[PDB]
Amino acid sequence: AYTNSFTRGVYYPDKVFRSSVLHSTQDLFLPFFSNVTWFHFDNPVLPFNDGVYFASTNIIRGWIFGTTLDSKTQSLLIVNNATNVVIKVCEFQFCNDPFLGEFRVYSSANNCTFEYVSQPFLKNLREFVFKNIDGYFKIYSKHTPINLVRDLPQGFSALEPLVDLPIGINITRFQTLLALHRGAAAYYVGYLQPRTFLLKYNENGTITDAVDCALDPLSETKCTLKSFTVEKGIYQTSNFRVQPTESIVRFPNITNLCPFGEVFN
Amino acid sequence: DIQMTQSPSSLSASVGDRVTITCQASQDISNYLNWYQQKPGKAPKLLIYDASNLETGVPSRFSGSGSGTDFTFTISSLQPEDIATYYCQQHDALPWTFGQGTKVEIKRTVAAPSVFIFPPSDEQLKSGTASVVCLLNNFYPREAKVQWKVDNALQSGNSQESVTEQDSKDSTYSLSSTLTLSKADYEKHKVYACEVTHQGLSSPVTKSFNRGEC
Amino acid sequence: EVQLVESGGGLVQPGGSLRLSCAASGFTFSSYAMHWVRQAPGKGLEWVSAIWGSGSNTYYADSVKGRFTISRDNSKNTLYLQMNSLRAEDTAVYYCARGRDLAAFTKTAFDVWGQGTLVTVSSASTKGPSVFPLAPSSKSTSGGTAALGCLVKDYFPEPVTVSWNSGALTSGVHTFPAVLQSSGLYSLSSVVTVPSSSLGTQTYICNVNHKPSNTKVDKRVEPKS
Amino acid sequence: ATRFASVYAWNRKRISNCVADYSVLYNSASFSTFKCYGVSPTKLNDLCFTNVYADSFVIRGDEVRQIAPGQTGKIADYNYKLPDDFTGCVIAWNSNNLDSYNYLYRPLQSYGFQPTVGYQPYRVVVLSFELLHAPATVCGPKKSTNLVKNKCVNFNFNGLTGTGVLTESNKKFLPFQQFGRDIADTTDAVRDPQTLEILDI
Ligand SMILES: *[C@@H]1O[C@H](CO)[C@@H](O[C@@H]2O[C@H](CO)[C@@H](O)[C@H](O)[C@H]2NC(C)=O)[C@H](O)[C@H]1NC(C)=O
Numbered sequence: 001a002y003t004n005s006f007t008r009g010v011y012y013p014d015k016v017f018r019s020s021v022l023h024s025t026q027d028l029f030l031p032f033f034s035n036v037t038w039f040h041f042d043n044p045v046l047p048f049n050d051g052v053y054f055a056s057t058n059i060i061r062g063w064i065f066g067t068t069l070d071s072k073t074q075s076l077l078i079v080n081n082a083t084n085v086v087i088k089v090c091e092f093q094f095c096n097d098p099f100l101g102e103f104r105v106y107s108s109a110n111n112c113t114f115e116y117v118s119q120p121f122l123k124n125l126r127e128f129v130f131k132n133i134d135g136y137f138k139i140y141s142k143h144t145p146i147n148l149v150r151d152l153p154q155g156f157s158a159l160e161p162l163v164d165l166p167i168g169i170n171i172t173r174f175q176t177l178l179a180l181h182r183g184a185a186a187y188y189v190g191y192l193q194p195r196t197f198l199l200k201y202n203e204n205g206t207i208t209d210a211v212d213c214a215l216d217p218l219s220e221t222k223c224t225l226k227s228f229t230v231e232k233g234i235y236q237t238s239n240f241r242v243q244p245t246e247s248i249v250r251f252p253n254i255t256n257l258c259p260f261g262e263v264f265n
Numbered sequence: 266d267i268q269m270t271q272s273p274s275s276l277s278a279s280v281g282d283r284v285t286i287t288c289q290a291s292q293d294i295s296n297y298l299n300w301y302q303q304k305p306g307k308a309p310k311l312l313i314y315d316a317s318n319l320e321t322g323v324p325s326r327f328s329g330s331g332s333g334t335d336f337t338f339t340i341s342s343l344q345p346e347d348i349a350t351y352y353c354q355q356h357d358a359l360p361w362t363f364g365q366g367t368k369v370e371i372k373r374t375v376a377a378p379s380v381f382i383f384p385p386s387d388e389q390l391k392s393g394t395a396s397v398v399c400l401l402n403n404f405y406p407r408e409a410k411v412q413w414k415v416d417n418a419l420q421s422g423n424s425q426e427s428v429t430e431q432d433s434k435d436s437t438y439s440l441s442s443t444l445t446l447s448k449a450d451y452e453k454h455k456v457y458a459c460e461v462t463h464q465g466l467s468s469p470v471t472k473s474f475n476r477g478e479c
Numbered sequence: 480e481v482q483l484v485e486s487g488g489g490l491v492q493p494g495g496s497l498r499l500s501c502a503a504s505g506f507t508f509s510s511y512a513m514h515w516v517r518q519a520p521g522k523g524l525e526w527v528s529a530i531w532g533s534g535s536n537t538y539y540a541d542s543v544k545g546r547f548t549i550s551r552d553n554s555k556n557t558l559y560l561q562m563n564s565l566r567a568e569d570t571a572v573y574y575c576a577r578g579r580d581l582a583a584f585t586k587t588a589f590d591v592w593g594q595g596t597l598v599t600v601s602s603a604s605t606k607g608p609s610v611f612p613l614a615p616s617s618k619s620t621s622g623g624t625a626a627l628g629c630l631v632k633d634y635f636p637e638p639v640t641v642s643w644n645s646g647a648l649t650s651g652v653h654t655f656p657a658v659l660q661s662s663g664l665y666s667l668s669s670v671v672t673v674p675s676s677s678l679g680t681q682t683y684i685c686n687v688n689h690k691p692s693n694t695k696v697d698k699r700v701e702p703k704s
Numbered sequence: 705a706t707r708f709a710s711v712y713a714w715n716r717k718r719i720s721n722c723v724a725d726y727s728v729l730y731n732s733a734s735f736s737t738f739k740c741y742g743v744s745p746t747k748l749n750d751l752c753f754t755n756v757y758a759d760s761f762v763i764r765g766d767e768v769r770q771i772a773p774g775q776t777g778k779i780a781d782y783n784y785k786l787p788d789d790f791t792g793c794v795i796a797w798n799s800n801n802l803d804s805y806n807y808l809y810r811p812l813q814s815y816g817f818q819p820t821v822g823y824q825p826y827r828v829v830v831l832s833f834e835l836l837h838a839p840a841t842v843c844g845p846k847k848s849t850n851l852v853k854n855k856c857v858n859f860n861f862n863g864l865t866g867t868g869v870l871t872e873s874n875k876k877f878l879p880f881q882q883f884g885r886d887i888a889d890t891t892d893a894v895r896d897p898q899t900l901e902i903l904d905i
Contacts, residue, residue, distance in 0.1 A: 266541070295706070308593065379621075388611060439655070531808065533811070
C-alpha cells in the first residue's frame, strides 16, 4: 500500500537563520506528492539508501540501523525507554523477529564503539528524518496534532534538527521497533533524493512554505524566478536534451592475423 | 607481617538489617584486600575484591567499601541463606595473613530451651562405657550455662559439650552436653542430673534422674 | 567450567610425608598462578604456599617455610604439594585455590577455591565405629515431646550419614557435629525429637552409615520398665 | 586510577566524544617522563583526533625505557608491544611508594620489588591517537575570551571569523540556529556560546 506525502518532509537544510526570504537549496528532501510506503502488525527490514523519512501516529519505541546486523558489523540502536533515550553503536545480534518489552531487542550489547544518552521527544503525528552525510548521522523530528488517520495531514510543517552523531557507520538497511505486548499501529516510510527545493523563511525565521523545483513546470518556474508569485509571461526554466540510449563501437573488421598458430602449434 | 583487628568478634542483627564489619590494616595497603563468605563444611566464597568490586554471579545486595587502612563493608538486606562467617584477607605484601573472623547470625526473640537427660543404655554397658547426655535444643541466645550435679555436688572437668551450627529453617541452635563415667563408678553413685541456665528461663531448670529407676 | 578436584589427602604419622594432588579442568592451568590455603579444625584460614607457573618462583608462609614444597604439571595440568616433617599443629583441611596473578589486578582474589582435602597428622590407626542408643526416662512428664537418639562412638575418619526407618520416618531428625575425645578417637551423637506418646507403639530404628568403612547399623529403642 | 592494570593485561580505555585538556597534565610535575612523537605537546590543544586509546600498565625501571616504537626485550617481544608506525605519547612516573610480589611480568617472572631507581616500578600510560578511522570527535581545549560590544573587533564564533561591531539585537533566533545571514549570503547576526544571546554584526 502507498500514500501521497503531499507537502510533508521539509527540514531546515543548514541550521543558519534566515527571515523574510526565499532560499534555494539542494539536498536530500522528500519529494512533494511522492509515494510513501504505508505499514500497519509487521515490521520487516527496509533499505536505508541515502536517507529515510519516517512518520507515525507510544507504540513506536525505537529504530535499528545498520549494514549486516547479527553482531557481525556495528549497528546503530535508538531506544526510548523510561524517558531517557539511549543510542548505541554496539555489535548487537538482531532477532529473526525483533520485539521490545527488561528488553530483548536491545540485548547482547557488547564490543561497543559509540554510546550516547539523550532526552527523548515523541491523535499526534511524529515525523522523523534520518540521513548520513560524510559520517554525520543527522536526526530531525517534529511533533504535530493530527485529526485524521486515513492519510497524511493536509497541513504544512518544517522539521527542526535534533541530533547530530559523528558515528561514521555505512548504513544500508533499517528496521523499526514497536511496543509489543502479549494493538497494531500504522507508520509511513519515504525515501530522499538530491532534489532542489525553494524554502520560504518568514519574519520569525520558520519555514512556512516550499516548492519542489522538479514537481511540475510551474514549480520549476517558481524556483528559477526565486518567488512564489510569477507574473504573466514566458519564462525559460531548463533545457530539454534527449539522452543517448546505447554506445556503439565500430572498427575495421578482420584484417591480417598475427601467426600465433605458427608459434604455439 | 600485617595484623588485622577485625571487630566486633561477633554481632547480632535481624533479617533485613544493615551489617558492617571493620577490617584494619598495617601500612596503607590501599585496596589490596579481599572478603570471603564461609558456611559450615563449605569452602570460602569471594564476597568483595579490591574493597569495592563485586564478583560476578553474586547477588547485588552484597557490597563492600573502604580503602587504605580502614575497610567499612556494608550489607543491605539479610537473606536466610546469608548466614556464614566472613573473613578479610590482606593481599598486598606477599599475601599471607587472614582475619580472625566475625560470626554473623540472625537476631531473634529469646526462646527457652527444653532440657532432658539420657541415662546410659544397657547395650552400651556391655561395651564397658557409660555416657550421660544432656540435650539443649532450640535455644537463643547462644549463651547458656550448664551445671552438672551428681549427689548434689557440682561437677566440672568430667563433661563435654557440642553445639550445632545455625539451622537453615529457623536459625536456632541446638546443644548437646555429654558426661562420661565408668560402669564401676556408675554403681558407686545414685543421683545424676544436669542443670541449664539460660536467658529464656527466669530461673535455671534442673532435670534429675536416679540410676536403676528409683 | 572451572573445576579443582582435590585428592591425595589421608592419614600420616607425625614426621612422615604425603603428596597432595589438585587436578584442573576447564581453563588454562599453565597461564595462572596456583595457591595452597589450609584451615585448622575450628580455627581461621592460614595461607600455605604458592607456585606462580615457574618452577623457581615459589613462596611459602612463615609457619611452613622450609618444610613444604609445591609443584605443578603441564600436559595433564595438575598440582602437587610436598609436605615433610609434620607435627601435631599441621592437622588441617587443605584447600587448593586459584589465582590470576599473571595480568588481572582486579581478580587478585582466589576466583574459585576448591572443595578441599583433609589431612590428619596423627599416629592413631583406622578403626570402625561403636554405636550406642540414648534411652529416655519412661516417667518423663515434663512435656508432650520426648528426645531420642543414637550415639556413634570411636570412629575414624570422617564422615558419617544418618537416616531413619528406611526413609519412612523423617520428621525431626537432627544430626550434631562430631567431637574429639581424650582417647584420640572421635565421637558423634545423632538425636531425633518425637511425640512422647509414640515411644511404646511405633518402632524407632536409627540408621547410621559410614562410607570409609561401609558399615550400616540398625537399633531399636524401647522405654525402660 | 586507584589501581593500575598489569603489563600482562594492559588496559585500553577508549576515549571519544569529549574535550581532552592536556595542559593540566602537561604542566603537572608529578610525571617522571612525558614523551610525544609526531606532534609537539603544545599544539595538541588545537589539533583534533578521531579517537584516543589509553593503555595503562605498570612496569619496572629496568624496562621503563622499553615503551617506545621498535624496541626489543622480553617485555617488548612478549608483553605490551608498540606499533612500528606513528603512535601518540608515552607518560610515565615512579610509583615506588605504592608498587614497591603482587606485580609480575611476562615463562613468567615476578618483579623483585625491594623498597630500599633502576629497578623501581614505573606507571606508564600510552595515548594512541586515531586520526583517520572515522569523523573526528576528540578535539583539544579552546579558551574563550570576553566579548566587547559597540567596537570594531575581530571575532571568531565557532569557526566563523570576521571583523565588525557586535551589538544587541531583537532578531528572534530559533533554539537550533547559531548564526543568521542577510540577503546576498553574508552574516547579519550570530548567537554567542556560553551565554546564548543574539548579537548583530
Ligand atoms: C556555561 O558555564 C558558565 C559557568 O559555569 C555559566 O555561567 C553561570 O550561569 C549560572 C546560571 O545562569 C549563573 O548563576 C552563574 O553566575 C554564571 N557564572 C558566570 C561566571 O557567569 C553559563 O551559564 C553556562 N552556559 C550554558 C550552560 O549555556
